[PDB]
Structures are given as C-alpha cells and as structure tokens.
Design a protein around this ligand. Structure first.
Ligand code: 91U
Ligand code: NA
Ligand code: NA
Lengths: 27, 249, 9
C-alpha cells in the first residue's frame, strides 16, 4: 500500500549510494 | 554478508533481526511485510538435523535496527511472537525446498523513519524482474567470511538456472533461485552464516518501490568461487502467504 | 557480545 517506499529515501526523493547499480542491470 | 558494505541509515527499514531470548543472541534475519507480519526462512525456526526447533516464547523480533550488538534506544522496536507458521511442505530432509515461514506479532509495530514494510511481488513484477543478470540486494548481520559492527549490504546478480544447477550436487527446485558473481566477473560477495531468513530485494523501475523477491536460504561455504547463494522464490509461494494471512488475519 | 535488552521485553 505504502509498502516499499522508504521514508529516508524514496519519500524524500533521495537515492541511496548503490541503487543505481540495480537499475542499470534492468536491461 | 561477505564483501558487502555498511548500510546507510534507513536504507533497509524492513530488515528484521531474529534474536534469541536466552542466551541473548542473533538467530537469523527476516523482513517486515505489514505492521503485524514478519517473513523469514523455515530453517531459522525448524531444522531437526541441528536439533533446531524454536517456539514463540524462545524468541523476539528487533525492528529498525542498524547496530548488531547495541540496544538502539528510541530507534529500534522489540516485538514478541503471537504465532509462528511454517510451510506445510518445507523439505528440511533433502534440500530446503519451500524454505519459508511467517511470524505474527503480539502487537503492531509503529512505523517510523527506520521501520517500514517492503512489498511482496505480483506475478507481473516477478516476471519482469526475475531475470538472469538483473541485480538484487541482500542485507544482514551475519559473518563477514567463512561479525560486523552494523547492518551490511551487497548487490548481487541473479544467475541462469543451468549455471545454478551445475554448481552443486543438491537437487534444485522451481521454488528456489540462485544469485552471485561468476569467477569470470571480477566482483564477488555473498550471504553467510547469520544472514539466513533475510530479504533479497529489487527496486521496480516501473513504480520505484522495493519488492522482496527472495529469502536467504542456503549455500555451501560463503563466497566460494564457482558456488552461488540460494534463495527461496517468494512469488512462487505467495498463495500460501496470502492464505496464511487471510485466515489468521 | 550483545548489549542486554531491557528486562521489560
Ligand atoms: C553445504 C551446507 O551444508 N550448508 C547448507 C546447504 C544445504 C543444507 C542442507 C539442505 C540443502 C542445503 C546451508 O547452507 N544451510 C544448512 C541450514 C542453514 C543453511 C545456511 O547455512 N544458510 C546460510 C547461507 C550461507 C551462504 C549463502 C546463503 Cl544464500 C545462505
Ligand atoms: Na548439479
Ligand atoms: Na561464489
């Protein structure tokens, strides 16, 4: 519902230091 | 976690620590999937070859944590178990098939910056993301090789099923997948003892939410070349998850 | 190795 959205990251539009590595693999 | 790094604060707010009451100690990892339900591996609670059988009262759940040893006043929350459910066809005898268990909490935990549930996949997210080469993230407070000061994190790519099979003598099922780098790849890393029961998560590029696709289940050694970690395939057992939560509210 | 938890829990 509200699941999977982290208060200190997605809910603030901040990215953690290595999540882009995951994105870049979704090829 | 082997060859991982220090988590950032709030980077995994669904992470749960399974803690032994007496003597007080880390038992396993786990994950928060709503305000009263925790997801983990069946073998963390029931594994007769090690004379492992825990009951509700042997245990507590610690949520919101970051430090392994410290009691994080004003940050962590600790919860008591109302009822453990283990998959009726969990195969501890041969290969840990269907290695999954739910834990219902006595009282709801309160959400916070450090406490928040992860999502469980629908068939379309599963189909889109469970592909060889796609990376997921595993987190936990287990050994650094074959114990950390704080939660550790490592990103690892899902491995083609023929390579999973060929890496082991164990009989692999459709209720499992494996993840990790090949020797040929340079990069390494893996789950290890004490990481069991923790989440393998992926961030959907479709809606930007984190989904739990796997549960840390087994491996031979930790971070050995040519071997891979094995994960319970959460989407494949969701009917049972749903079922359990429905009836037991 | 574990800071002991409050007696409460
Ligand atoms: C090789 C070995 O003995 N180790 C076993 C593999 C095996 C256990 C018997 C059933 C089929 C799987 C194992 O990994 N176990 C035996 C029960 C606990 C679990 C574990 O250590 N999990 C931790 C772990 C370590 C490395 C990678 C992952 Cl994904 C998880
Ligand atoms: Na094989
Ligand atoms: Na390996």
């Amino acid at each position: 519902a509200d699941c999977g959205l982290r208060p200190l990251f997605e809910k603030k539009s901040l990215e953690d230091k290595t999540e882009r590595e995951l994105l870049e693999s979704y090829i | 976690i082997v060859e991982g790094s220090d988590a950032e604060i709030g980077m995994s707010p669904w992470q749960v620590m399974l803690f032994r009451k007496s003597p007080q100690e880390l038992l396993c990892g786990a994950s928060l999937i709503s305000d009263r339900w925790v997801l983990t591996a069946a073998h963390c609670l029931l594994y007769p070859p090690w004379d492992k059988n825990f009951t509700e009262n042997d245990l507590l759940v610690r949520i919101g944590k970051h430090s392994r040893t410290r009691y994080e006043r004003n940050i962590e929350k600790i919860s008591m178990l109302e009822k453990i459910y283990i998959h009726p066809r969990y195969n501890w005898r041969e290969n840990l098939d269907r290695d999954i268990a739910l834990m219902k909490l006595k009282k709801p935990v309160a959400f916070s910056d450090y406490i928040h549930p992860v999502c469980l996949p629908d068939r379309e997210t599963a189909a889109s993301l469970l592909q060889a080469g796609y990376k997921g993230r595993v987190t936990g407070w287990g050994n650094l090789k074959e114990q950390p000061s704080v939660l550790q994190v490592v990103n690892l790519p899902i491995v083609e099923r023929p390579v999973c099979k060929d890496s082991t003598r164990i009989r692999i099922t459709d209720n499992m997948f494996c993840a990790g780098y090949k020797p040929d790849e340079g990069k390494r890393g893996d789950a290890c003892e004490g990481d069991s029961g923790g989440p393998f998560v992926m961030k959907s590029p479709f809606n930007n939410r984190w989904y739990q696709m796997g549960i840390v289940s087994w491996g031979e050694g930790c971070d050995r070349d040519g071997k891979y970690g094995f994960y319970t395939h959460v989407f494949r057992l969701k009917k049972w998850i749903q079922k359990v939560i429905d009836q037991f509210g | 190795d574990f800071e002991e938890i409050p007696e409460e829990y």
